Paper text:
Class 1 lacks density for the periplasmic components but has good density for all extracellular proteins, whereas class 2 has modest resolution for BamA POTRA domains 4 and 5 and for part of BamD, but with poorly resolved extracellular areas. The 14-stranded barrel of the integral membrane component BamG occupies a key position within BtBAM. It forms a tight complex with the back of BamA (defined as being located opposite the BamA lateral gate), with an interface area of ~1,560 Å2 as analysed via PISA33, and binds Bt4306 (renamed BamH) via its extracellular loops (interface area ~1,720 Å2). A feature that clearly distinguishes BamG from FadL channels with a known transport role is an extension of the N-terminus of ~10 residues, which protrudes through the lateral opening in the barrel wall that normally is part of the FadL transport pathway. Similarly to Proteobacterial [name] complex structures, the cryo-EM maps suggest considerable heterogeneity and/or mobility within BamA and BamD. Density for BamA POTRA domains 1–3 and for the N-terminal region of BamD is missing (residues 18–71), and the visible periplasmic components have a relatively low resolution. Likewise, density for β1 and β2 strands of BamA is poor, suggesting heterogeneity at the lateral gate and a loose association of β1 and β16 strands. BtBamA has a striking extracellular loop (EL) 3 between the β5 and β6 strands, which contains 13 tyrosine residues and probably projects inside the dome formed by the SLPs.
The β-barrel assembly machinery ([name]) complex is a conserved, multiprotein machine that mediates the folding and membrane insertion of newly synthesized β-barrel outer membrane (OM) proteins. Cryogenic electron microscopy (cryo-EM) structures of the [name] complexes from the gut commensal [name] and the oral pathogen Porphyromonas gingivalis are similar and reveal a 7-protein, ~325-kDa complex with most of its mass on the extracellular side. Remarkably, besides BamA and BamD subunits, Bacteroidetal [name] contains a 14-stranded integral OMP that is intimately associated with BamA. The remaining four components, named BamH–K, are all SLPs and form an extracellular dome-like structure over BamA that may provide additional functionality to enable the folding and assembly of the many β-barrel–SLP complexes that are a hallmark of the Bacteroidota.
Numbering used by the authors:
A (entry chain A): 291 to 457, 473 to 545, 590 to 681, 697 to 884
B (entry chain F): 23 to 428
C (entry chain D): 72 to 264
Write the structure that this text describes.
Amino acid sequence: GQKYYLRNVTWVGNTLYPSEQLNFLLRMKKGDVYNQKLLGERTSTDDDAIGNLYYNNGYLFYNLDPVEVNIVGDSIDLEMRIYEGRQATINKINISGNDRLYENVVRRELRIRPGQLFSKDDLMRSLREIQQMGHFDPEKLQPDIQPDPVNGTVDIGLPLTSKANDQLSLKFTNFSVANLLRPGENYRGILPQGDGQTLTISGQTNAKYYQSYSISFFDPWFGGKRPNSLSVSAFFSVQTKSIKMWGLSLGWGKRLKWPDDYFTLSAELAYQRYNLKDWQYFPVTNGKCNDLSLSLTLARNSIDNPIFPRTGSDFSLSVQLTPPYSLFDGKDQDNMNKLHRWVEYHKWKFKAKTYTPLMDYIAHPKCLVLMTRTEFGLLGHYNKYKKSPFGTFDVGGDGMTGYSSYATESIALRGYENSSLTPYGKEGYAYARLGIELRYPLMLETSTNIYVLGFLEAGNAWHDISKFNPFDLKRSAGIGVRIFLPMIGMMGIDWGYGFDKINGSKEYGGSQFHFILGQE
Amino acid sequence: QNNTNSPYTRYGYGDLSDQSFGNSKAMGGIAFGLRDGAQINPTNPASYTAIDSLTFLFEGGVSLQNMNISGGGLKLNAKNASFDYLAMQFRLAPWMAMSVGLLPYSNVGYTVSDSQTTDNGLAYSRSFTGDGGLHQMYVGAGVKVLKNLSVGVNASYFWGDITRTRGMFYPGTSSYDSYQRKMVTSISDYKLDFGAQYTQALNKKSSLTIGAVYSPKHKLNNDYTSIVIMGASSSSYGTEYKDVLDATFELPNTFGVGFTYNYDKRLTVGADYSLQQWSKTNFGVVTSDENVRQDFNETFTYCDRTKISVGAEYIPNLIGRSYFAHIKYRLGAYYTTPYYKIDGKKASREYGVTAGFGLPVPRSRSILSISGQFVRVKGLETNMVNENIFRVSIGLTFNERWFFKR
Amino acid sequence: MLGMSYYNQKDYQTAAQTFITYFNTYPRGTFTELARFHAGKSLFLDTPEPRLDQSSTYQAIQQLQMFMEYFPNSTKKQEAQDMIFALQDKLVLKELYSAKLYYNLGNYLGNNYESCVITAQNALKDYPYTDYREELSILILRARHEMAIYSVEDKKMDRYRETIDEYYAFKNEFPESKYLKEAEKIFNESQKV
């Protein structure tokens, strides 16, 4: 037994927001069917409801009540009665579950502070930063909000769940140099963990065809006082008469404030040397070559989960110069091992990923997502004849296979053998790659994560930069699956059918399989 | 052969691609007067000022098609797929917006072969192919000079390569030299495009917009070359007798105008007209070889292209809880006289009808723009082919809160 | 009986759980204060470094407090008393590091100097009698002056007088202290206004 006609609506208690705007946000008008959720769902459940409009703005000391009057005939008159309290200031932040990571590491990335006013956007951003940091599980995080109406303040509990990231190679992700050079109170036989710094070592010890050594270190908060970071690395490798390559680099990153606070700029300086005699898979055959390179990279990253992102984007724009010795600064097979004592180039790249959910998300968080890929590259030259023999692009297949060599950049193009579009004598000086992927996860958990996908791809590469043509591409489609392991990176299976011929031959097209490892 | 298989593309720069984004591709291509602020529109630079304050738009598209080709009693079909736009757009001030993107301008694709036998018993085979196209990369901006009025410009790099071959092969013959002439035209210059838009506040709920666009006549830096290959085979490259020529290439004056009516933000209708002054362009080459000269004068010749298009979209009751109330519904149709001149007379005449959707992503402002088209090209003289082409398109407008600050 | 063997091998978890399960199932088991106090020290000895999760330290505090009232007769009441004091000082040291972090970051995005003073004040109120009262007080004084420098021009004299109040409060609390020199330069800068 109930009435059915909305005759009037009314407001009492409001000061912070205009009454007509709340009429609009309540989405009601006189002369309409009387219901209850129609009011309630729009006042206490939905993300644009009035109650949330107060709650998310730090006014957590509130209540609300739909008053019904004039219950006559077909009709009810309605009045919104609400309470405006004092805007809540944060009193304390409690954080728990950090087995292997000092609070110093995490409290510096929070966006809320004790002593400032509460707001939903700051809290959500802080949880995004923690999720992206990766030292904790990106799932099953939720803050334990506890208000206090006597003092009118709120304290936030952050219960977190820990996971350890480590994998011949080693990927120590939370390794501290201060705890190495001066243990705090007891190293107790354990590695010097903490501070969120990371160390990594890798190499091949086959020694009868391949041999290599490498090391890298990254400090995300240099000096412990500002978000600017230090990165250093070095490497060395033999391959069978032999070919010798070694080098090192140093870089420096910085968060920006101009477009937004998601942009990060990075600058890096690098050195490499190549050492050869009677070698044959490069145009160079006998000598020693050097290169000094300065790189600027502008990037923006706004995704939620590193392992299976569901919203946001990842944009990067990069340029990499080496000084122009061909010009007046340096001035003055036939003679090709000549003039490349020092190599010359300027390499440009653009790289963008895009993620969107296709079925709401938040609810049934297993979800389903549509991905989008786009990347372009150019290896330009100051002088028409002194084109660089090193740093060229190599495209086709899994991409991982190219890291048997370190003087080229390997680019996966799925559905085409391996290194197929760029054979000997047709090294790539420009490339393009595009693709749609539709992905569904089977399982998302602390230890292991699984998802399956179908894809459309197109890509190409050119030996001559002046013939770059992003609308003439080799095209592919297929399906695949990937696995994330508790103590190893990705492993996955991709099948793809290459529709279009390469250099007039159909030999490399058709059905192909790719076996991805590590991470793309 | 990544955008077309129509053998009309043996003439001119190929066939011009319409850089019509997702909403316009379903709405028949009525892009001059449009101010749909949720999706990008490079066809009129004055349209950029409609973007919401904190947003960054990033959009690209894909097309799949099946072409039925008919002529002289023969019937065949060829099917293909393409990538056909990509752009970024963002706001710089309460009164200015900027965009950067990558667009096609024209494409070529044809293989048309043949096999024969003479009365003396010699069998021979011919093969006429073609590949490449012209492309455009642009940076543009639009500004508000008055509360009703916006103007803008696109400055574009404009480069490409069109290659066209003729062969003569003799299957079954033990040892011989094949003849093949490969005429190539590389182009690298710039292109300017200008536009303006004006909006009027009719009857307090509706609005009517008018737009115009213009681009001036231009002469292009180029590298036209006349290669003849002799003796190439499955094992050998043969010899190349190159020949470099002083050819002149151009772009014509182009004009376009249209309007769009809009009501209660639920309904929009509009129509466009455009004309391109191709017949007033001075293409030509200078050489001592008449065969080459004749070919140039017979392959680069044009007539005035005109286009007429109409379309609409409808978005019913977008505040009610049902997904089919959030879907943008689109329709359109268009008419074109292509610029092809074959023999002395005009070549073809084409018609098209289009329809599509505007699927929004919940809890986001991204839009997926599945759209479909049917286009018929009719040859105006008995020796030329007719085409029925079916096409379906996918396009995602990504849209995220980007320039926000505390 | 097993716990003392696990205690001698320094396997504090098994020692603790074999002690406690026995005096939970029956008020003294059959080993009485020895099992209780061995369990208390075993639970103490797993204590993390002062900036990890701290989960076992609150449990240790409450376990020792409940020991003091199950066996108030015990001579081990003292040995629990100084243990709960050591635990309280570690809990305060965690909050002290938090306040130091907010002072280190400073007037970066957000504010973080007002945060420092309220964090260390919360420390002073939540654990009144700790050793670290001197460090907490001088951190209040430094953060007070630091906020006074960077505040808006309508709202600086009040922060300066809050700073001088903290100066005189520090002298009242500690008539002599090793940290008075920097305090006195803070005073000489702020007393001008």
